[PDB]
């Protein structure tokens, strides 16, 4: 392969910077003040290295690299398993060890070594006997909690790997009894009913079919404390729920059966026929009148997204209702992975409930999405309080006319890519008529009539432009500008009519009204009124006649005014008349022939069909496909703190209070008894919790204790004794319960780093790691001074929502061209040299764009790192940052909460939104989607200096969300599978739009539109991607959602209902009922039910009593006893419920329920202490 | 004679196109066979008799 | 949930049942009196007052049950827990208090008894004669212990007492004529499983449409009829109830109940009390229905509304009537006392002298300053419901009857595996306060 010498240089520069950071990290770590004498984050460049460094076995990288090129990705796993069992990698011992190692390695290879399933999801592998039927050996797999967040596709492959391993080792099947199957059914049903709603709910027949054919056992430890009826089942050691096993069996082999059967047939495994069988068994009249019928029969509305409504989260459009979101096939610069494109104008007019990064609950393509501004598509159409109608297509007009808006007749447009349709396998909804379809028809007509060749969206030859201009009698500059930006440059209405009457193409979509949104009888009445009582000013362009003004009195118009509103026609009301202005009178009167042929209603016909039957200029359906959506989970750009904030990993016990303040304990001179580890100096004999001797200056050795005789042994003698007490023959431990004096330690640290002005220093109550090695207090002092926080492994993290980006302009991120050339950028995406800030530059795979809050936090982190290097380690400073613009060109690590591997990035700019912009490959490398997910970023040097494997929790799940290995190069072939469906074409062709009306599956035209998968393997997968829609700015619009500015629920519901009232495509009475059914009534009923079974708690102590003490005081403290659930908790949502009942048309069931709830609350507290809806209800009946 | 042959050819050109064609196109295509004056006279006579009409100035349709 | 479209239903407005001319009822004077009723007694930071109310409730319960316990002649030399230190080793004493915890060891039982003055730990050895009773006592019940004390801090007991029914009773005077009474409960009007035909046949029976001489004589001597709770199915008791309702409006439910109870003859008096699915208080004790919601059952000329619970005197005998929601607490604690035999749990409730002792389980208790659920005076007959199974037992002279239901098996019941016994009716004799006949209408269902 021949790379353009640019990608190789890019990767070489990245490696140079990584080595530069590692040099100082290694020089600092070798002084001896830290748990290890070397850096604890190994670096790898491909999947083989990650698999070797995560689960082993040693020497697997070479074999993996050979076999992947020889056979492929899938079969190399089987070959590695075969080699492992044969003993080519050493002697492991028992067969359980071989089985466990083989399963872990195979799963790591198949999952590409990123998801933490092989390390933490699988707990044990054991060989068991069928003691109930035949006493034959069978293989069992044990699962843990972390498997519940490992993805559906990773749970299913574990069963396949276990089956292959048990087949290879020479074992028998797992033969269960009826009690086992009944227990599994009961467990699944109980889990769904009690703890969490499963994403896929299988029927008991499916569960029995699955349990009767799986050759391995799927068990695990108890995760939830919910008892099950069936008990004492042989071979199962617990009587509580086993969440991991049931979630695997429900969301793997069942939910993802198609992927599993694909893998099975590709690999060649035998014995999985039942899954294949289950998969295969589970699966006179006008033109537009018939298309609507076929559309409804083949695609039906879905209301799964609107089932639940939370107060403060409005509903924007009803399922498949005109007036909602229009559908436009395309991909913007900053959308496409799972992200929608939305005009900023409709963000404002919905009371700013939508900001950049807000998640939507979509209906048609998938389940969720993220919003990103696109300023080229259309915006809302509004009706003012004086009767005027406007089209809002820009930010400023929306900012100006917001206060005068009475109704939102149309929301606007949504840009959804074709790759989403391919990924989710959704039938193609018929396409609306837009600019690019029209421009393709235009160029095709020119080619067919005058033999002139032109190409949209590019630069054409001058001779062809001149010839076309001569044949069309227009300015060549206008043609050149229209053919390269057909979405921002539009012709006047007379030119559109001329094009339609000369070339034969339909009318321009900009001047086409929503003709199919009204019935033909209304148009007939409007025609009669316009013919009878209207004044029209006519004009002339070249022979052609077009209207210029319409003035008709309001009394004669009558109810026909609603037809104009439903047609989306701008007009004004003044002095008792309605006036239609220049560009829209022609749009209204040209499709009707300037009142030269009479409009008559005809059965089995639509408005556009009647227009096209008798007219010279034809039309197309501007609006035929609509999509609904709902709000959920606003954007996040905050920091990351432990539940009580922590700044040092030093145990303090209860000597610091609730806040766990070490400084407070030092001030009072308290003595704390905590569980900690000590070190011993070889020469002087000092004992303490530090690593370097305060007197000698040498490194100390760990002390091992015996829990019975309490004898101390250094590390050397412990290794000599094989970590066992000679007198007791018991296992030694590295920690013991000891008493420490915080004052002396704090004073020593303060004198060590010359930091004195600290008011608070927060630690932890007790350590979770097995070693229980504490952190130096100087790091905590510096962290407190610089106001930064710490995580469970010693690193500092920042969490933000992720959004895609492929192309950018230097002016959006505040970076000059000179800095870009210093970074390495030299050309734009069309090949021209980089000289201006307005050009568009393609983005490199590992370059990221941060937010401004991220910059503000990382500036503090950089100051902390510099202070640490200067004072604690005695080394030169590294960052030297005074403003956040000084971090441009440095490195970070990206991580996801369910992974054990990170990826290195570079900072090139900042934006003003609350999202994290990066290349789609970057997010795919974290096994992540751009539909409302949040990831983490941390500075590289901080991670290298401060991360340690000794601080990690001992329990399963402690290695999740930790940088165990980081990747330095990005390869699209080993990132994820969703990004392989992303379309990278400049513009969709005519075949797509023509095949859209036939309701074809997206798999029938994958060869027409180029995708990422077609470039895999070749050097062209790193550069050359394209986009369909442009955007002026990627951070234009509101930044914070309105949901964060509201505290009370009454205000939330009031604003939500106002938004529902404003929008035509939302029925406010339906919203009022859903709120009561889903958020308000359940809370009131639950609180009223829990008030009479509550507990009582003392204030001084925290003892819980199941019934009140008789004397009214705590038996021990003597303090006051308070309630747990109060009267204020059963009445907070009652006024809002009464208002909903009294102002909105809800059903009688809900009214009576709320009235009885009010009566019940009034009645319970009886012995302790004319216009209303309840009184009218009880008086009417 | 030449006019009789030319009108049929112009009718043939406009027939297959099935839409309005600019005068420059017919002038360039029929220019080699016939001089400009004869083409203009033929267009005027065809308009006078009436089988074609002129929607926009300079564009001719059946 | 999801409420669907409107539906059309009937409210039994054309159902007329007439008296049979072949039966002439006997003329007997009527002696009924409502001895006890909740409405007879007349009982800033809110949390303070609520805590005070609960404390006063439990103090009142302790005082009442102590006054009951002290009537036992074998109970003497009672000492206060706070004054236990004065007790000598040789001297034996008695302590009376509530029960906080009951834990089982390999050598006996260990309790925690709390009084108004202190809390002490009690040890009952496994060889004690009264050991099985201590293994079945529910928490929040007033018990008594007898034994010695230790300076170590453990009270060593050798006897255990409960407030029970006395073993001797006086023979009441006879009656000039014989009168019967009918006990029913759990009608559940408005449900899809409500047995209309069985109830119509029951109404035809009370009007003298029979085929046997014994039934002819029984129907002519019935003067009372008692209904205890769950007269309607209510609305919003559990999610998905709309799809299981024929009449989804509570006003029309009470209208249908009144229309269907207007065919009871004039010479029969009815006593109706609230339940758990009715328009009443959300926690026991319940004063009465809501007048504005349950008006149609107030206008019947031969019906008087009672409370949950209430005591009714009929010709000199006391009838204790409650819905009986406390049977679920006793079943969940003591092993072996399953459903389908609701008599033994009732015996336990009677011999603890409290209708719902446990607090914090599956029975709600309202914050009242005084405890009205203590059985102050020993009754003659106790009636309950809420379990949907018929049973009858006798304990030391009193009769315990659980009226069946008129609602067939539902999906919720067959999920939890309980089989109801629909359409079973007890007939009691006032002179003896015993069930003498059970009527069966399950064939028509
Ligand atoms: Fe009931
Ligand atoms: Zn030393
Ligand atoms: Zn030892
Ligand atoms: Zn206390």
Residue numbers in the entry:
A (entry chain B): 1 to 283, 309 to 1194, 1205 to 1216
B (entry chain C): 206 to 267
C (entry chain A): 166 to 208, 218 to 619
From the paper:
Replication Protein A (RPA) plays a pivotal role in DNA replication by coating and protecting exposed single-stranded DNA, and acting as a molecular hub that recruits additional replication factors. We demonstrate that archaeal RPA hosts a winged-helix domain (WH) that interacts with two key actors of the replisome: the DNA primase (PriSL) and the replicative DNA polymerase (PolD). Using an integrative structural biology approach, combining nuclear magnetic resonance, X-ray crystallography and cryo-electron microscopy, we unveil how RPA interacts with PriSL and PolD through two distinct surfaces of the WH domain: an evolutionarily conserved interface and a novel binding site. Finally, RPA is shown to stimulate the activity of PriSL in a WH-dependent manner.
The structure of the Rpa2WH–PolD complex was determined by cryo-EM at a global average resolution of 2.9 Å. The Rpa2WH domain interacts with the DP2 subunit in a region that lacks any known DNA-binding domains, previously termed Accessory-116. Interestingly, the Rpa2WH binding site is 55 Å away from the active site of PolD. Surprisingly, Rpa2WH binds to PolD via a novel binding surface different from the canonical interface with PriSL. Indeed, the primary interactions with PolD occur predominantly within helix α2 and strand β1 of Rpa2WH. Residues I474DP2, Y475DP2, E476DP2, E492DP2, Y496DP2, V527DP2 and R567DP2 from an α-helical subdomain of PolD are splayed across a complementary surface of Rpa2WH comprising residues K229Rpa2, Y230Rpa2 and K233Rpa2 from helix α2, residues K222Rpa2, T224Rpa2, S227Rpa2 from strand β1, and residues E261Rpa2 and Y264Rpa2 from the β-wing loop. The chemical nature of the interactions at the interface is varied and includes a network of both polar and hydrophobic contacts. In addition, two pairs of charged residues are involved in interchain electrostatic interactions: R567DP2-E261Rpa2, and E492DP2-K233Rpa2. Furthermore, a focused 3D classification step in the cryo-EM data processing workflow revealed two conformationally different populations of PolD-Rpa2WH particles. These subpopulations (named class 1 and 2) differ in a displacement of the distal side of Rpa2WH, pivoting 7 Å around the Rpa2WH-PolD interface.
